[PDB]
Symmetry: D2
Subunit: 462 residues, 4 copies
Amino acid sequence: NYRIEHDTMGEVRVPAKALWRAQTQRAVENFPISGRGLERTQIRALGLLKGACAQVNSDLGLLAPEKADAIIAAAAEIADGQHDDQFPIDVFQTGSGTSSNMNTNEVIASIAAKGGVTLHPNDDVNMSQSSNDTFPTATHIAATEAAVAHLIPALQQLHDALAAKALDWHTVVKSGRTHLMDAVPVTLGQEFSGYARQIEAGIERVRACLPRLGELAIGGTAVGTGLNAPDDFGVRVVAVLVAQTGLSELRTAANSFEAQAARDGLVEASGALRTIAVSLTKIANDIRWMGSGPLTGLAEIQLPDLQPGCSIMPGKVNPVLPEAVTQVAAQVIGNDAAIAWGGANGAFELNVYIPMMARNILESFKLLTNVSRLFAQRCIAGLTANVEHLRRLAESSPSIVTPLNSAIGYEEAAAVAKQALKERKTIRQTVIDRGLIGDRLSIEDLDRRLDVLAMAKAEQLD
Amino acid sequence: NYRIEHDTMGEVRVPAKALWRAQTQRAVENFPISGRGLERTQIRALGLLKGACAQVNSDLGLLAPEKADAIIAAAAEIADGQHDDQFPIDVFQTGSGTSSNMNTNEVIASIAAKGGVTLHPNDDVNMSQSSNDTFPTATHIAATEAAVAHLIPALQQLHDALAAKALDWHTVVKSGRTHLMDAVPVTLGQEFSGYARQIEAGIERVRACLPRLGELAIGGTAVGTGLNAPDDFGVRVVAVLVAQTGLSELRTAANSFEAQAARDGLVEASGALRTIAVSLTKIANDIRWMGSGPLTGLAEIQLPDLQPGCSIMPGKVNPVLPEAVTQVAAQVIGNDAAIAWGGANGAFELNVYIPMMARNILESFKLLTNVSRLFAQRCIAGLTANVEHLRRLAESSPSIVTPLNSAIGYEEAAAVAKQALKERKTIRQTVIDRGLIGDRLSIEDLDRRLDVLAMAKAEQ
Amino acid sequence: NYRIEHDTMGEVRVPAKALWRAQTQRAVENFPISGRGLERTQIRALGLLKGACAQVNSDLGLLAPEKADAIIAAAAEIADGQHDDQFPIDVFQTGSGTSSNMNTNEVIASIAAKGGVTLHPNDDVNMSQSSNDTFPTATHIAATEAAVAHLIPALQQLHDALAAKALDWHTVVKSGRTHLMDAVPVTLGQEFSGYARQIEAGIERVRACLPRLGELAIGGTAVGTGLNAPDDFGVRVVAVLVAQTGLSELRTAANSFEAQAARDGLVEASGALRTIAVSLTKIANDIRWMGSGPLTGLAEIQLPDLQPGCSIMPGKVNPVLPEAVTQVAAQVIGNDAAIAWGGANGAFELNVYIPMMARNILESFKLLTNVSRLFAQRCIAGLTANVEHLRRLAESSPSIVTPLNSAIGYEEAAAVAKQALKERKTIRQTVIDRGLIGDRLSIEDLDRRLDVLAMAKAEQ
Amino acid sequence: NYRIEHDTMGEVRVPAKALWRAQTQRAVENFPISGRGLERTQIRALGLLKGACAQVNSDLGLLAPEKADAIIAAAAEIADGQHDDQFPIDVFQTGSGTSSNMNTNEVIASIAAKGGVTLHPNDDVNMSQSSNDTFPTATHIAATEAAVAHLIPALQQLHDALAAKALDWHTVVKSGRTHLMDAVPVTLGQEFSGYARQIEAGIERVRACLPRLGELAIGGTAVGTGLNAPDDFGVRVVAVLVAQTGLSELRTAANSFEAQAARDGLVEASGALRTIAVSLTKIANDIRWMGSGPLTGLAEIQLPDLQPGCSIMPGKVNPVLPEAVTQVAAQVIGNDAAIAWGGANGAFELNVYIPMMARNILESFKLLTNVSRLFAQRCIAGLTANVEHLRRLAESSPSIVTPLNSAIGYEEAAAVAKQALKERKTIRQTVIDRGLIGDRLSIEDLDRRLDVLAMAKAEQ
Ligand SMILES: O=C(O)/C=C/C(=O)O
Ligand SMILES: O=C(O)/C=C/C(=O)O
Ligand SMILES: O=C(O)/C=C/C(=O)O
Ligand SMILES: O=C(O)/C=C/C(=O)O
Ligand SMILES: [Ca+2]
Ligand SMILES: [Ca+2]
Ligand SMILES: [Ca+2]
């Protein structure tokens, strides 16, 4: 069963029970590309914004209070998620998001009609607005909320898990590795202090993008001039959004033309997510290499077992959380390339890559948030160190000859490391055998300099 | 509400009506990352492959016919999308696809149990297999099927629509543009013949990757050695798959270690899709620039109206199909970067980025297929040329002085073009008014050489 | 002619006159890959750092004043560029930059020898150091200097040129374009204020990355533990670098392990350069589209003529500066992908992609700096507006019906716009012809609403 | 000292001794961006093409033999490398390469003038040509030559070195690793057979792009219509280029508009180079991990020592060739992103990103060629295997319980692997201790199944 709806292009047959109308139905037929529509977070931001716009139009005496109350009530239902099934339009729609904007207007008009209030989707629900300021506004609201309320707390949780290991393993000595080769001693805690700093720097990177990510185009309307909107429409709508979201990062854009002709704030934010993906790849790769083997690998640490590793090789348990992290990082890198591509190709008064840029940035925020919490809770928290094996590794490195450089010189330390590795003998034995004990180096000096934990120079903790 | 299942790690509470068992349930709790599981096409390939493996194990007398028949029947139901709700594992799972492989084994065991047959998910359903050869095999089957049966016909449809316009507009003269500036004449048909060749070359690029995209790891098992499988398991399974799908491009990998340690065939195929995204961006951008305005743009052609353009500016109609094409192309570029990143980071006997690489390559195939057909049907087929305006544009270009180079020289031809633009005069009148008619250039020569359609040199 | 030099691996034949020694010569034979060595800016940072390290070793009484004075004098010669021909090692060397570190140590030892001072390249010139902290320190010094002293002033110059045009063309009305289609009026000044803000935001993005770009690994030595260096070596060297360069952004890293195991500050900085490339592409594309034609394009503005446009089409002048800008932006995007790839692939205590990451980030800084100044001086400064053509474009847009929405409604405004375009009539006459003048709209109100400059709502 | 030269824009002061003239000098002032001009290979292809064009113009009686002979002689000097110092224009010039085309025309006219032959750079040296067909033609000649004559032989050399190790180490048993964890046995030779296949597939990928990489735009002139050129100019010039280079891969483009409006063949070729970078990353990473330690790593193989590893840690030797390979791969990925970005942004009759695309594709060919030969000669050829350590690693893997699956079942095999790892006992003794010897498994069958070399199933 179908019903007739109309727009300025003509009559359109719409499924009888759908709350959307003519323009949403045309967009359903024009863009069957990915088979996926807007996400819960996107629909929420659109509903929140539509309600705020109706409230301001009402306050300024431009829209009758009964009509504004119907929009506010319908928009609140949309924001809470009661009508996500009424947003069937593909992500790969017209680049301004006109179709999803009209989707919100039409669904509100249908909800209001069930309450006995007649609203025109353009004249009433879209009063003082354009898709060109509302769709990037709803995108930037969703991106700002994803950064502040979800990603930053998830990264803080991962940072705290890494920092707790850095403290726990502060004096657990092991051999450092540079170029994958035997280096001088480090502690496991020192390496984890490095990982924790990468995540802390990741939080700093997200926070540094917020002054421009939180800029909203609302009030600029069609081309940024604010035509058909009151001069204070933008600041009044943002006032409501800040009060209702608690997001102090939300503000009217510094320049109304830049805020619509470009989506540079999304490209900037993706760069921060991409740097986090780069940091997470290093952390996850080191952790699975430390857990490698056990018998054929490094066997430095034990990762918590999360599931049987293999359908054919029995007993084997795999580093599945570092694998999910490195695959998420690859996705964030890909999404980042798509966002920049869209960002660069605006023309004149409008960048028409917004639905695609919105899909990718919001997905990158989601993946990084979810995988960071799982990595912290299901992997980092439960790691255990193989203390004895790590100590043996530290002591086996021929590079432990290095602190003798000031006493015997680099060339003689290299002759010591050579005469030892070839004869499968210790650095200590070789130093004595080459008659190096004397004025330049006593026996007490040698054993003090060769102590692997002292060689790691771990900071003294109170 | 829940039932107990177990694996070698212990007991797991599973939803009472779920057809999956212990290992799928662990994966549900370990990877809640994207909130999306395998696509219909991926589940089909896994079901298809599981059935083919049971058939070969049965043919070789390794699996009792009653057990093999139960796997074949259950796997066919999975392949035919009767149990997609029984595959809840995230894309961002363990990099070998072990979890989705065990998901298929467990769901087949549960289906077989309803038919009165007891199957062990490892010993029976996974006999002669590993996730390490089965999951990349199912990925390469799905990718090969997407290329041959869906993308190539969609690109052929777009090519034919572009070639139809090249023929219809063969003598529709217009001004060429280089660097966005006034150039010599072209026909609108010649431009469309360029677009048609880009799509034809795109088909050639997809076809050229098929010998390596169609390579399957099946038979290599855990590390590529084929341990716990018959020596001819791979060749026998590939023969069953080819007959069951009609997909002749499927083949056993040339090297069983390369086929599991790497996913280079996916990286190669993504490069072809990325080149198609690059070609489509040029075609879609030119088409929306040709349709620009009408009054403030180039207004060369009219795109079919597909929907009201704007919620605030009434009457305005936008080039929505070229916008869908250029956004899809951006996504394919991004997906391509993710595929290469995963492809480079294999280690020793296994590349563990397969679920992520599979997601991206299959999505790129889907988006390009669907948008190419929509672009051909809802945009290219219905384009109309503004023949009058195009003619005025061709004749207005000062670069139409170019065929006079052999008669008056480049330097004098430049002086003519500058003066004609400055005095808002024709090239013809500027040539005469500069006193250039004489022994080197007769008036008949001038009139002959300035004909814009003849200047486009359209093939007879 | 050659001479014999030695290292712990053995004898090496070195060109007789070369100031480098055995380890540089081995690196010349091991890495003939790109055929390009370190840039002037990289050799300066290495020379500056080596001198600062010798000064601190001297201040702490670890190095004899005669030896320290010889290193300081030789390092100052390297810093000034007298010896760039003594750095022949390829960019694509060992990933820590060990070879270029030993190149600096060996060349300083050879220069000091000419002055009668014997220095061991390891024991003296490299005292308290590693390549693992010095090579990323010299990279981060060069990158910080490129950002603060060169790119930010170049972007400020471009911003000021764009802002000057935004002011000069504040009331130069034209038609806005959305989706490349006829939109409501804007001023050329308003568009240029948008471009100005993109560059201003670009400066903010570079400034926001400086707290982490300026972090130096110096003092961490081999693995970040500071082994074989005094405990205050890093803080003393940084203070000397700050006093000598005036770059207050140079600071000791917050974590000595993160500062060597990763190059995340370079990845972060590249992201800011990549965003600037994205902004510059939009600005340059709009400018060449505004200058397009003239007769077959938009012909909105005139770009200064910089060179003859075409070897075959006489008279034609091309937008060469916007083309230089968009090609630089493409390079910065590519360099950005190479930097991130290297950045992700560190292992344990060291990221061994530093020479490649250094090449790409420093090149992106250089290209953006040089093309931004050329774009501001040779293109933006000299632009002229075609004021009458721009006014006719604003008045011709059917979307000028938009401010009537509140009086006649969106649906009627769409019927007005469509009828106006069909009958090739003005919006004003179509409103009167449809009998819309009455209680909801007076002729006085209509004429006020249709004024294109008033419609652009330019700020007072 | 300077001299005056002129073009259609006016008079230009040119350095007295420079062989270039007015347009090259304007380009020197307009584009000081990267500070690097065209490469030796690019200037060679431009010289070769200019000579071939003069020969064809002479053959068709369009150019006086004295003038054609002077161009052919001068173009041969340019192609030979005698005048690379006469090409000062930056890579980041006008996107068509107009400046470098005029650079070639002007330098040829100056060389010819020394023998008393007057040639007009446009009317004579550029007869029947445009920069729009010659600059992409010279780019595609250089790219085709780099692929056929340099990269493919370098990859063949690497393939042969990898295949030689696959043969030598055919029965050198080791433990396989999947997910970096203990897997079933493989041989070192089997892994090298996987590496050899990745390079062999890389050669196949380069060969598959040659039908489109070798397509030349020559003859299409300004916009692809062939205006001001003979109808067979393209086919005649290509015939000369094939005879002089011996490159049968050089062909006239299938469509003259596609060949100039787009550079899709460069994007396609870069995708093959990018796949090779992906393959090389896996191979180089496995090799440095196998050579890791020795005492704190895997210590599976020994890489040849090429230089002292470290300025601070004495004795240490690093895997510098795998590091140069992985950094080259990162650069090829970055260059690939820049090529695709330029490729997608053509407009109408011309893609104006050619100098940037040319720089990146030719650099990717060069880096891959040079690093592949160095990797084969200085690393792969000299590798040695630690045979006894490798066999002990194979025997130590608990996953050697895997071939018992058919006898005791997966669940019981897991119980064996658990007990053995927990009690530090062998798989063999755990099987006996669990009382599994009986009807399903004899002691003789157990010992045959646990033989690690037999478990690797190396081909006879
Ligand atoms: O949908 C709108 O509000 C705007 C559309 C346009 O600029 O075309
Ligand atoms: O699930 C499998 O078949 C393989 C797993 C592994 O290699 O760990
Ligand atoms: O330099 C040429 O041959 C062409 C130039 C143009 O198309 O502008
Ligand atoms: O050259 C150095 O100082 C360090 C080298 C290494 O870690 O191998
Ligand atoms: Ca707050
Ligand atoms: Ca039964
Ligand atoms: Ca041949």
